[PDB]
């Protein structure tokens, strides 16, 4: 029953007969009258076994009294009926048949192995034409197709000494006679003469096929079927419905087809039929076999009366409905329930309300066993009837069993592991599950009718798995980011906000209280408001340098409310944390602080307390929503009438034919966009600080206690954006096009929209909602791919003993520090003794987990950058070490060995995308774009420091930059980067490089809706390849007549001017070119498509003038829909459409020759003196200027980088950090926290494989691709033995191909592409020894990770020692 590994190989005719326990010779299923199996039919009991246990058909031998007996009368063995799902049969085919999977499933396999095109084989198979098997006369060569009339010619002339045949017989004979050995050596010899790239691929392909064929012990004959296996009856059942009807599997219709045509062929052969008829029957037989194996593959799938194509064998393995996806990696499960969920605010964090009726049924066997131990139930039938009657004593027993027994709650969809949590159940009368509020966040559960699923862990092991790993109290922190996922929301935040926040005097200002208990006493007595500003004596407890906690006592100036909340606060936390007015953002930091100082128990109790008090005071507060809470600013109608006269001015300027339609569109949209901000700001000043109505002496100003403001400000619910629509102006809506409507919604929701404003709202709304339903599937597919590629990766070792790691640096995207070095590096092993600036004393050690204390020290020392141990640089083979990974973010300490990290990583990366696809879309309505980045303003005074910039002074007297990627740093006094910006091309700098600037001053200024082409030289403009009609167009106006030129691209361009590049050439007064200073490049700026030009031919220019203005339409909502495709292209390692060029080797740059403008590059390094040339397109312009010391991987031309090139030139750390940063840019744009180490896991899996270029001491040799783990283990044994070392190159693989590259074919087939995977594995004779998780889940065994790592390593040592 327990086996070690699984092999797939080709089924021999002989092998198929081994499984068969009888030949089916009849289409008969059963007798119409006695529904008993028909003789030698598809359900024959004489072949597949007895229908009833230990009973023959005719009923001569019954029960175990006759054990192995074969009834002489009926011919049925008396055994278990179980065998009818087990025993197979077979069919003897009168003509051989091709196995469609090894014919149509590409690569052709049968064609690839004969080196015969597929078309050619089929023409042979359908009996269109003859194929030569052996022309002894070299006059006719092998595998040469002869038509009907070509066979008649050679037939008389040569005849005899040529054998050519037709149909499956021919190809099978051709396969049989081919000698794999001899042809192998022949092809190897041909490979040596002139191996062109594609010739060498196809030759190496057939070589590996021949080698693999001899190693597999598969024979080519077996590609052709002479014996056809029959699936067991119960696996293709014919069962009677209640209504006297029958229902049967489609396989039975398909088997019947095949048997009828095959037996008819036997008949036609016995009858010596004429050949055309024989042929048609052989075609028919091949059609029916092909239909039976894989229906919709070769042509039209054969249909039932329903129109629908019959489901074939291949279909039952293939796709979602197939065995793997549906019945084997996911299952229907016993001891499972589901119901509506509702709140249980009374519950503690480790509890859930479980309906009595539900729990009575889930724990049925436990109740029966306890009932027999109490002697209440005599037997199981009596126990059953006692529970059916629901007797009073049974409830007391049920109550006894469920105590200390954890149950699993699950919510769909299960995106990360927290989607399942364990609780201790609390029995409740009533049919809905009660959920703890604080874990609503992990489940994404809101009680608008949500339902959840219940699972009972049965075994002692399962119970302890639930209580220790999966209990809600044990799982607080997100595994994705080191952040507490359990955080108060909604009413809880509102209550605490209400209590902490202060008010002017109110009841009992400036009183003095003995303890927070006197404060509570005063409030509930009615002599003090919660917002009274009163001084109280609190004793806070601060932790000292050692374990001992220090207590201190002082007079704090807080309010009554804050004093009462201090009672919930544990001793150990400072009083100052509650002394501010508390919002959601402050309460999360409260919980974090609590967790790091006190630990788990205190945090859990504290969290519960916070929930109780939060609700309680929310309800006391009497907080409500009236229409008077939505306050319109008095100055709306003025702002709007003004903005309306303004838009009228530009409409009038359009009607005059001066301003173009596009300019007016842009300026009307700008007017309204500013009007909207002004109205919103007016509402928010009038609402935020509208309590200008206070007291004590005379009038004072304070925060408004308007309900909706409190809700938004606390972070309980709503935001300023929502309030804009409610009380302010709704704003500009977006069309389904994405384009924005010119006339915005002037009204708000309190005011009420009119028919047109509402109709316009609809578009955006429904686009959002449709995005939720439809896009969630692309995101989920990405989760699935990710999970599949990181499956196997588990913590295997403690310490790999590697010195390797990636040098991380602080992240400063935009301007605000997005990812601090500490935040990026926290809880990461520090590889290599990394000290302080002055290299003369070790600051930090080697293997040392970065703890919060250590990270705090890094900030005091101002560490620039740190080498940190990463998953990618781990040496552990078949997994990673705890050190290279670092902290389990979900635990708050160093990861445990055995934890299945890859799955965690893929879940962590995938979930946000999948969930954000639903968030800003059911809710996604109002369109609020923002991209008016015109000028950069510096805030901290400092010296201007530009990097990778090549500007040039203009006529005006300003530093105009002529570089694409230009960055602007902000050096301080000592000298360290504080702020960083992105200066685009053609930007005007106020000061130059090294110049000092003051705070709040525009350093850089430019136009956002335009990408200028700026010159580097002065003189006149020449038109080259700018023929009117072919490449450009022309349009004039009136009296004077200013014409603009618009450059057409390959879309709007004729076939005449396709190879013509349009460019504005610079010339001097004479008419000759103007050399660009210090280069042999005549000045020529190539204009791209849709480039608008105002200067016509023959116009004088200075350096720094704008030649043309390329439009920059970027009015998108970005959101998520658009980001995930970027992410998917990264993880799939797609080379971009115009990749940048990079230097392959270090040395000295030499420009060479040109093929009509196409740039050759004759590059000559110093030590590697032999030259290296590369062809470059004519129009692609290089950023660097030749004659240069180039490092490996210096950017030559601007463009996106292919991850493959990055790996190939600058190695692993380079490409790992490219993917990490580029992906993280997307998720950071959406405010999603994912640690780099997760993306680094997946990257490692992408870099699994490596291609060997040059032979080792093993049988690797040129061009084999093997796992890097295996070749490094080989290189360990080579170092010890010497011999020929193996030279190799690591290869990057996209997620999909990387998952298919795993040696495990069960894993590969279960993912996707299943037909192809199983043919490749079957032909290679591949054996899966089941190391991976997928594989073990499929066979229903113990996982090789987590709990299972103990048992699985104990098996691995049993395996190692015999």
């Amino acid at each position: 029953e327990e086996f070690d590994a699984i092999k797939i190989a080709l089924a021999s005719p002989d092998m198929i007969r081994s499984w068969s326990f009888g030949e089916v010779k009849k289409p008969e299923t059963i007798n119409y009258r006695t529904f008993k199996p028909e003789r030698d039919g598809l359900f024959c009991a004489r072949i597949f076994g007895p229908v009833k246990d230990y009973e023959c058909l005719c009923g001569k031998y019954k029960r175990l009294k006759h054990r192995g007996v074969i009834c002489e009368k009926c011919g049925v063995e008396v055994t278990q009926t179980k065998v009818r799902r087990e025993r197979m049969g077979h069919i003897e085919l009168a003509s051989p048949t091709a196995h469609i999977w090894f014919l149509k499933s590409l690569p052709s396999r049968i064609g690839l192995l004969l080196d015969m095109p597929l078309r050619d084989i089929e023409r042979v198979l359908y009996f269109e034409s003859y194929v030569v098997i052996e022309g002894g006369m070299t006059n006719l060569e092998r595998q040469q197709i002869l038509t009907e009339e070509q066979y008649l010619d050679a037939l008389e002339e040569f005849g005899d000494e040529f054998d050519a045949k037709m149909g499956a017989e021919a190809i099978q004979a051709l396969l049989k006679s081919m000698d794999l050995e001899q042809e192998c050596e022949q092809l190897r010899e041909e490979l040596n003469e002139t191996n062109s790239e594609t010739k060498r691929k196809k030759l190496t392909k057939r070589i590996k096929l021949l080698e693999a064929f001899v190693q597999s012990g598969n024979k080519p004959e077996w590609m052709i079927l002479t014996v056809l296996p029959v699936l067991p009856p119960d696996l293709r059942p014919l069962v009677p419905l209640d209504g006297g009807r029958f229902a049967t599997s489609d396989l039975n219709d398909l088997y019947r087809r095949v048997i009828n045509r095959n037996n008819r062929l036997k008949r036609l052969l016995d009858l010596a039929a004429p050949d055309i008829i024989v042929r048609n029957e052989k075609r028919m037989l091949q059609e029916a076999v092909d239909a039976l194996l894989d229906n919709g593959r070769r042509g039209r799938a054969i249909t039932g009366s329903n129109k629908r194509p019959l489901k074939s064998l291949a279909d039952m393995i293939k796709g979602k409905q197939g065995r793997f996806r549906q019945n084997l990696l996911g299952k229907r499960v016993d001891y499972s329930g589901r119901s509506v969920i509702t709140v249980g605010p009374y519950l503690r964090l480790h509890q859930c309300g479980l309906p009595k009726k539900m729990a009575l049924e889930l724990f049925k066997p436990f109740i029966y066993g306890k009932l027999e131990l109490r002697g209440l139930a005599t037997t199981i039938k009596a126990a059953k009837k006692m529970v059916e009657r629901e007797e009073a004593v049974v409830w007391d027993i049920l109550d006894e069993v469920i105590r200390e027994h954890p149950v699993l709650l699950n919510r769909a969809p299960t995106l990360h592991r927290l989607g399942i949590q364990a609780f201790e159940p609390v029995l409740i009368e009533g049919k809905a599950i009660q959920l703890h509020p604080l874990v609503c966040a992990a489940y994404n559960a809101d009680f608008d009718g949500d339902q959840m699923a219940v699972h009972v862990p049965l075994t002692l092991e399962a119970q302890l798995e639930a209580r220790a790993l999966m209990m809600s109290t044990n799982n607080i922190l997100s595994p994705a980011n080191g952040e507490p996922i359990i955080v108060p929301s909604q009413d809880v935040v509102l209550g605490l906000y209400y209590m902490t926040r202060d008010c002017v005097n109110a009841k009992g200002e400036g009183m003095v209280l003995t303890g927070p208990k006197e404060a509570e006493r005063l409030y509930r007595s009615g002599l003090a408001s919660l917002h009274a500003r009163v001084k109280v004596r609190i004793t806070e407890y601060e932790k000292d340098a050692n374990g001992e906690l220090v207590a201190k006592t002082s007079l704090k100036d807080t309010t009554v409310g804050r004093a009462i909340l201090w009672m919930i606060v544990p001793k150990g936390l400072p009083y100052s944390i509650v002394n501010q007015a508390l919002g959601k953002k402050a309460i999360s930091k409260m919980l974090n602080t609590c967790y790091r100082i006190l630990g788990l128990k205190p945090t859990v109790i504290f969290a519960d307390q916070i929930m109780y008090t939060g609700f309680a005071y929310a309800a006391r507060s009497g907080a409500s929503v009236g229409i008077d809470d939505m306050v319109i600013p008095e100055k709306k109608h003025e702002i709007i009438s003004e903005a309306e006269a303004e838009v009228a001015e530009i409409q009038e300027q359009f009607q005059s034919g001066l301003v173009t339609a596009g300019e007016r569109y842009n300026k009307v949209i700008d007017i309204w966009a500013a009007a909207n901000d002004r109205v919103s700001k007016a509402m928010m000043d009038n609402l935020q600080t509208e309590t200008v109505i206070n007291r004590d002496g005379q009038e004072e100003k304070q925060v408004s206690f308007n309900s909706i403001y409190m809700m938004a400000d606390s972070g309980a619910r709503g935001s300023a954006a929502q309030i804009r629509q409610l009380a302010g102006m709704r704003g500009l809506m977006a069309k389904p096009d994405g384009s924005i409507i010119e006339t915005p919604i002037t009204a708000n929701f309190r005011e009420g929209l009119n028919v047109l404003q509402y109709f316009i709202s609809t578009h955006g709304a429904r686009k959002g909602l449709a995005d939720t339903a439809l896009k969630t599937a692309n995101s989920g597919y990405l989760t699935r791919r990710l999970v599949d590629v990181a499956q196997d990766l588990v913590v295997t070792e403690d310490d790999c003993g590697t010195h390797e790691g990636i040098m991380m640096t602080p992240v400063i995207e935009g301007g605000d520090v997005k990812e601090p070095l500490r935040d990026r590096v926290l809880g990461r092993v520090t590889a290599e003794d990394v000290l302080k600036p002055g290299t003369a004393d070790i600051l930090v050690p080697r293997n040392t987990l970065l703890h919060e204390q250590w990270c705090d020290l890094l900030e005091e020392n101002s560490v620039d950058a740190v080498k940190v141990r990463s998953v990618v640089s781990c040496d552990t083979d078949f997994g990673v070490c705890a050190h290279c990974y670092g902290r389990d973010l979900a635990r708050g300490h160093i990861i445990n060995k055995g934890e299945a990290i890859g799955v965690i990583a893929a879940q962590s990366i995938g979930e946000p995308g999948t969930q954000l696809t639903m968030r800003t879309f059911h809710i996604g309505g109002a369109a609020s774009r923002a991209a008016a980045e015109s000028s950069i303003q510096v805030k901290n005074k400092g010296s201007i420091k530009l990097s990778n910039v090549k500007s040039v002074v203009n006529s005006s007297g300003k530093l105009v930059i002529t570089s694409r990627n230009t960055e602007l740093k902000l050096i301080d006094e000592f000298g360290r980067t504080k702020e960083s910006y992105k200066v685009p091309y053609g930007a005007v700098l106020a000061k130059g490089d090294g110049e000092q600037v003051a705070g709040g001053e525009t350093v850089a200024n430019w136009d956002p809706h335009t990408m200028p082409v700026i010159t580097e030289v002065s003189g006149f403009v020449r038109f080259t390849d700018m023929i009117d009609g072919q490449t450009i167009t022309r349009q004039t106006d009136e009296l004077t007549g200013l014409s603009s030129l618009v450059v057409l691209d390959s879309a709007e361009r004729t076939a005449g001017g396709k190879d013509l590049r349009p460019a504005l050439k610079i010339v001097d007064a004479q008419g000759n070119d103007v050399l660009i200073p210090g280069t042999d490049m005549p000045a020529q700026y190539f204009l791209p498509g849709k480039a608008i030009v105002q200067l016509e031919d023959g116009v004088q220019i200075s350096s720094g003038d704008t030649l043309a203005r390329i439009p920059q339409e970027s009015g998108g909502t970005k959101d998520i829909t658009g980001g995930l495709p970027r992410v998917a292209d990264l993880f799939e390692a797609r080379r971009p459409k115009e990749p940048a060029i990079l230097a392959e080797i270090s040395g000295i740059v030499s420009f060479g020759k040109e093929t009509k403008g196409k740039r050759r590059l004759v590059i000559t390094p110093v030590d590697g003196s032999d030259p290296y040339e590369e062809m470059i397109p004519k129009w692609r312009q290089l950023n660097v200027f030749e004659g240069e010391r180039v490092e490996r991987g210096d950017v030559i031309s601007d463009g996106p980088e292919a991850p493959h090139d990055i790996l190939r030139l600058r190695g692993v750390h380079a490409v790992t950090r490219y993917i990490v940063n580029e992906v993280q840019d997307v998720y950071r744009l959406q405010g999603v926290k994912i640690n780099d180490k997760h993306i680094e896991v997946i990257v490692r899996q992408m870099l699994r494989k490596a291609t060997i270029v040059n032979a080792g001491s093993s049988d690797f040799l040129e061009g084999e691709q093997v796992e890097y783990s295996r070749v490094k283990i080989a290189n360990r044994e080579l170092e010890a033995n010497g011999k020929v070392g193996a030279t190799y190159s690591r290869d990057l693989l996209g997620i999909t191909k990387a998952s298919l590259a795993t040696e495990s074919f069960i894993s590969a087939a279960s993912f996707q592409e299943t037909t192809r995977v199983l043919t490749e594995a079957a032909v290679a004779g591949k054996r899966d020894e089941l190391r991976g998780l997928k594989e073990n889940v499929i066979v229903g065994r113990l996982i090789p990770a987590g709990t299972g790592y103990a048992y699985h390593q104990d098996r691995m040592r049993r395996r190692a020692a015999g």
């Binding site: 200390e404 002692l460 092991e461 302890l464 209580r467 788990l600 445990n896 709990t1347 790592y1349």
Partner: protein, 79 residues
């Protein structure tokens, strides 16, 4: 032990091994009827095993010791 398992995890260390050790002990009380060290206070075998590990009475190594002790004394008795 019931609500929070953190201190029990801090005794053994590996959550995964804590589960195996507490399951093997709970099986002893469930089937062998092996006597509890801590007062049960009406708790199930699983909880007793976790309390025993928290207080540091049960250990993978200690279980293996008492396994050979009792098995070897039975071998002695047979011969």
């Amino acid at each position: 032990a019931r609500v929070t398992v953190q201190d029990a995890v801090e005794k053994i260390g590996n959550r995964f091994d804590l589960v195996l050790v507490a399951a093997r002990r709970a099986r002893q009380m469930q089937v062998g009827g092996k006597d509890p060290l801590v007062p049960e206070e009406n708790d199930k075998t699983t909880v007793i095993a976790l309390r025993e590990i928290e207080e540091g009475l049960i250990n993978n190594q200690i279980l293996d010791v008492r396994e050979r002790q009792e098995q070897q004394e039975q071998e002695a008795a047979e011969l």
